[PDB]
From a paper:
Kinesin-binding protein (KIFBP), which is mutated in Goldberg-Shprintzen syndrome, binds to and inhibits the catalytic motor heads of 8 of 45 kinesin superfamily members, but the mechanism remains poorly defined. KIFBP interacts directly with the motor head of Kinesin-2 (KIF3A), Kinesin-3 (KIF1A, KIF1B, KIF1C, KIF13B, and KIF14), Kinesin-8 (KIF18A), and Kinesin-12 (KIF15) family members, resulting in inhibition of motor-microtubule binding both in vitro and in cells. We show that KIFBP is a tandem repeat protein constructed of nine helix pairs that assemble into a solenoid-like structure. Collectively, our work describes the molecular mechanism of KIFBP-mediated inhibition of KIF15 and KIF18A via binding to and stabilizing a conformation of the kinesin motor head that is incompatible with microtubule binding.
To determine an atomic model of KIFBP, we used cryo-EM to determine the overall structure of KIFBP and a higher-resolution structure of the N terminus of KIFBP. Given that the resolution of 4.6 Å is not sufficient to build an atomic model, we wanted to improve the resolution of our reconstruction. To this end, we performed masking and three-dimensional (3D) classification on the N-terminal two-thirds of KIFBP to obtain a higher-resolution structure at 3.8 Å. Our atomic model provides a high-confidence positioning of KIFBP residues, allowing us to map the structure onto the KIFBP sequence, confirming α-helical positions, and showing the locations of loops connecting HPs throughout the structure. We determined a near-atomic structure of KIFBP corresponding to ~40 of 72 kDa, using this reconstruction for de novo model building. This places the KIFBP reconstruction and model among the smallest–molecular weight macromolecules to be built de novo by cryo-EM. The relatively small size of KIFBP may be the driving factor limiting the overall resolution of KIFBP alone to ~3.8 Å instead of obtaining higher-resolution reconstructions.
Residue numbers in the entry: 5 to 22, 32 to 54, 86 to 107, 111 to 128, 135 to 173, 203 to 282, 301 to 329, 389 to 405
């Protein structure tokens, strides 16, 4: 019996990879597998095997609020007794945020981070680290959001994957934070680095934001000089990018 349920599971997993191309025959997973796991008879293994199936059924059954009930009882089963709980908890966090109840959604995200640090996967660690930076933006804790944002852009750089529009936009907008805190010698670094990755419709207007960032940089620094009371190199540079801006 074990050989055939393994094949049925693998068939269902392959199916999930596909007018609608969805739902069809996917429900076979539930009836085919539960038909065997039911009479499972340490037997604790049955709890782990059920949790895996319940996880997939919960996520798949999203297309639907009923999916929440499936995810909760999975975590309940696991918590009452090695990385699955983390994968599932992140999903409940996002769900509630999308439902505009971010006051409580943050409770899941912050908990998952503390668990990782204290208790101890690597492939998915950066997801909650990215998402946590976002909810802080709605709570307007600007210093904390800026901190996490930087951490993800740097850590992301280790792993080979890179993108042309992701980095050019995000690295650019971060610079605005340091301009507001009058960091003349630090903000320069961000725009310079962003231009290099970019060098490696959507494909045309993507560049428009970069032009605007350099203009604000140049003007803010010069005007600072008028607080008191041979320098034109900064003015010619500004114009040199102004034509591109226009």
């Amino acid at each position: 019996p074990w050989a055939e349920v393994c094949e049925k599971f693998q068939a269902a997993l392959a199916l999930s990879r596909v007018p609608y191309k969805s739902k069809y025959s996917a429900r076979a997973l539930l009836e085919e597998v539960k038909a065997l796991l039911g009479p499972a008879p340490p037997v604790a293994q049955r709890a782990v095997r059920l949790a895996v199936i319940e996880f997939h059924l919960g996520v798949n059954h999203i297309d639907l609020s009923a999916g929440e009930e499936h995810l909760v009882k999975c975590l309940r089963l696991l918590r009452r007794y090695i990385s699955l709980c983390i994968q599932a908890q992140n999903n409940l966090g996002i769900l509630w945020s999308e439902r505009e109840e971010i006051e409580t959604a943050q409770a899941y995200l912050e908990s998952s981070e503390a668990l990782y640090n204290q208790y101890m996967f690597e492939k998915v660690y950066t997801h909650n680290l990215y998402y946590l930076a976002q909810v802080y933006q709605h709570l307007e804790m600007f210093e904390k959001a800026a901190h996490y944002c930087h951490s993800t852009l740097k850590r992301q750089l280790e792993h080979n994957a890179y993108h042309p529009i992701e980095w050019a936009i995000n690295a650019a907008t971060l610079s605005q934070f340091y301009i507001n805190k009058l960091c003349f010698m630090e903000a320069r670094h961000c725009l310079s680095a962003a231009n290099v990755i970019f060098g490696q419709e959507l494909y045309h207007q993507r560049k428009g934001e970069i032009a605007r960032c350099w203009i604000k940089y140049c003007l803010t620094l010069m005007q600072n000089a008028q607080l008191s009371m041979f320098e034109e190199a900064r003015e010619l540079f500004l114009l040199g990018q102004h034509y591109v801006f226009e």
